[PDB]
Every structure is written in C-alpha cells, then in structure tokens.
Amino acid sequence: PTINQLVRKGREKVRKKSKVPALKGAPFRRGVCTVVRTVTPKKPNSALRKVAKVRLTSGYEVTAYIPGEGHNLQEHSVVLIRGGRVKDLPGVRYHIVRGVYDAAGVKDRKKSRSKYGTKKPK
Amino acid sequence: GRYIGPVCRLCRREGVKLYLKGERCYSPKCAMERRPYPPGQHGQKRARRPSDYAVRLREKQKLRRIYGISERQFRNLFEEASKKKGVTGSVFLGLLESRLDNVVYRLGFAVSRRQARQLVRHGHITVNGRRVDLPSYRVRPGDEIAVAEKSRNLELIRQNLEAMKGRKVGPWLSLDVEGMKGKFLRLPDREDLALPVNEQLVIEFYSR
Amino acid sequence: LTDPIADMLTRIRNATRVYKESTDVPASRFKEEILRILAREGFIKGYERVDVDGKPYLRVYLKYGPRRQGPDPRPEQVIHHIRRISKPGRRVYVGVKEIPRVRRGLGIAILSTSKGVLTDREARKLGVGGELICEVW
C-alpha cells in the first residue's frame, strides 16, 4: 500500500484466539463430572477413550480427557482440569489432572508418575 | 549440588580423557585406556553420524564436565562472557579458570578438581590471608592462594605439594612450595591451555 | 511527471543495463548538482548541457567495467545500484548523527543540505545533515 494509505488506515494488530476459553485466563479450573463415559476416536484411530463432561466453577461445562490406564471417576466427582486437547477426540480441549480432588492417580505407574498423580514407591 | 556420581563413564561418552581422578588417570587402570567407547548397553555398536546439534551439545558437556560445574553456573558465566568486551571464547575460558576451586587444582594443592573443591569447602584454602570457603569465588590478578595455617600440617596437601615440586605449573600462575602459597598473575590467554575443547562450538551451542 | 529526480535515477539505471554510451535527462539545476556528485565520485565519465529538439537536456556519459570472460561477456557495472530514498510521498531527513554508510563506505549517499548537495563523507566533513536524496554503489 502507499505510505499515505498507511497513514490513513495503519496496520491491524492481529489478535490471538485462546484455545482454552473455559479456563477464563486461569491455569486450571475445578469442576464436577456429570457424564463419565467412553468415546470412540476419529480416523484412522480406533479405541474407547474415557472422557468426562465437567461443569466448571467458571460457569462453563466442557468435556475433559481422562489420561492414563484406569480411573475412578463417576458422576459428582470433584475434579481439576488443565489445558490440553486430544487431537483425535474432536471437541475435547482439556485434560483432567490426575491425583487431584477425586481423580485418583494411576495404579502401579512407574514412569512419568508426575504426569499421572502417582507417588513414589519403595 | 555438583555431580557426585561415577566419573569414567564421562570420558567414555565424550571420547577423550578428562583428567577427573588424579592418580588413576595416568595408570593403565584408567577406564579410558581399557574401554574407550560410550558406557552402557550399546557402546560397542558402531556409531551413526551425529547431528550438528549433537556435535555442539557434546563440546559443551565436555567443557562443563571438565570443571565439574553445574549448568546454571556454566551458563551464567557464559552470559557474562558474551555481553563482555569482544572475544567471548577467551573470556568464558578465563572466567572459568578464575574459579577458586579450579585455581586450587591448577596450583597443585589438590590432585583433582573434585578434591580441590573439597579443600575449599572444608576451609583449608585462604585468599590473601582470609579463609575463603567458596568454590565459585572469583580469583583475580594479584591474589595469593595459600593453605591455612591449621591445615598446612595435614597429610593430603603435604603429599600433594611434594609431587608438585616435580611439576611446572602454568605460566599465568606462581607456586612457592614449602610455603604452600601461590599467586594468580593474570587470567589466561587462549593458548595457555590446550583444553580438549573447541570453545567456538560452545558459543554456537547457545546461539541457537 | 511527478518526481524529476527519481526519473533521472531511473533513466540512468535503465541505460546502464543495456550498456548505452549515454542517456539524456531533462535539464534542471538540482539535477546538475547531483550529476556533479556522480562524476567526481567516478560513477559516470561526466555530463554536458545539451539541446534536444529545442529543449535543454543533460547528456549523461555512462561507464562500465571490463569485458569479462566465460558465457555472458557483459561487463560488471560501475553503478551497481542507484536508489531513490526521499520521495514526494515520504520525505526522509537525517541529522548528521544518523547519516548512513552505504555498503561500508564502498558506496555513496547523496543528500541535500543547507550547505549544498553533498556525499555522506562530505556531509560529516561539514558537520551538517539534510534530506537523503538517494544511495548509490
């Protein structure tokens, strides 16, 4: 564009769209589970992935992935959710944080136990 | 704190003797004589072409593992050298050699930098007449690094300075044996050392 | 025509790329003071004030390097680059402290100052700044 156009109109400072809008600018948000269920993933993956539909302290109600093998979550489980989509479960933009509130850790976990609310064993 | 683990696997991974034990490093018992391949299961498997990030990471671990220094300090000291006047490679090396625990080792009060560090942390070393028990203390041109009076009558520095009578310490340094004191004359130039390191690659490492 | 100066910087640029012996420029005083710089600095053999179809022009005598060997024998240019800086759409004024070096001194910058038209090295000699007319190398 001409310099005279830049004077008249300027350059539009781009704005970024958050990927975690349910978090309301917080790192984590507490909620309670309504539906705890399995969901199948999109092509080309096949599985029965465990998610929970969580109603948040920010008024929102979202779905949150339940990572690791085995969980103990059901309806009315108090939970803490974190940022994080699951590329292959469309519409799941959050992860439940293991080992917080009513999400138990992962039994017999030995590697990466910090990412699964599991403590150290003898 | 500093790395207090096995030490021969260090040279084995880097592929060059890092004289980190003192006596044992000059005997046929040095593990770099016997098995000069990386430690662990796959050492004797034939190596692949490493990436250039690998080449620079390796040069930078070699330099750091020489002085037995934590990455935090090694990077702290790098950044002071960077923003300093001009030649970074020389300054990083000179500021590294300016550490008290290192100077204790270069002077010969100790046989290894690990031991040198302990001679300081246990107080056996003074600087210009005061107990200075800080491994990271920055020695400067002029100071006199000695052994404490309540320490000079101790087997270790007696024996250590003995074999030092047979040794000729670096030019930038001074050593009066039997007085058990030395002098830091000036921070080293580039060629004062033939450190098995190309410090230019270390600059290249952090510039990524 | 909207910028007689950029027109002359461009007439010469186009003339040197086809290796023309000379190229005529519509005549003006400010353009002499710029061609004055280009000749003394070696970029052109010089100029003369001529008359084309009754009107005053400026025949600029260009210059080129030696005939080269290989494919494409065409000689390297003596004016590699001649670029307008200050334009009618955006004037560019630098004080003396922010006068640019063109190609680490191997090139020149022509400016207009209250002491006349100078090169970058001439400007700091007289200690004055002005309007950055063009850069050349």
């Binding site: 310099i3 830049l6 004077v7 | - | 955006r90 004037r91 560019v92 004024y93």
Partner: protein, 99 residues
Amino acid sequence: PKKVLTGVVVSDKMQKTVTVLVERQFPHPLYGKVIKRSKKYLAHDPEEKYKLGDVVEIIESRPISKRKRFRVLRLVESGRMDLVEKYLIRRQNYESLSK
C-alpha cells in the same frame, strides 16, 4: 513563553470572539511522512475588529471563558477567504457521509 500560534478566522458570528483555525505539520511517528493537522481556537476580540478571512496571531492568555484561553494578538493578513472556503466545503461535505 506564552504559546503564540498563527491561524485564520473561520467564523466571526459571535460577540467579542472569533474562531481561529490553526494548522501544524509534523512527521508521522512511524511512517515518517509529513502530515497536516488542524484545530479551532475561540479567541478574544474585545473590539470586534476581526472578520472572516483575517490571518491573525493568538497568544495564550488567561481564561476569558470555558474554551476561551487565547487573545488575538495582531493581524498578519486580511481577506484570505480562500481558506475559509476550504473549511466550509469540508463541513458541508459531511451531510454526504450520513445513514
């Protein structure tokens, strides 16, 4: 120093007060181009001696009223009705920007 500006009387339709239209040029803080900008000043004229098209100078004076903080200093040029026409045409052109 009391700021002294120079402008033109675009409207004399008030008692003891004229509207002085001042321009100022400066480079764009990012695109460097020189640009014009303008501003109207209600200036004191206790002798109602100044009319349309006068090119006057105003001096920063004590408040005469809300918005009136300048006294007309001296006439510089009389009869510049060409400038007032640039002003009025711009204002008249505003009805064409409506919805």
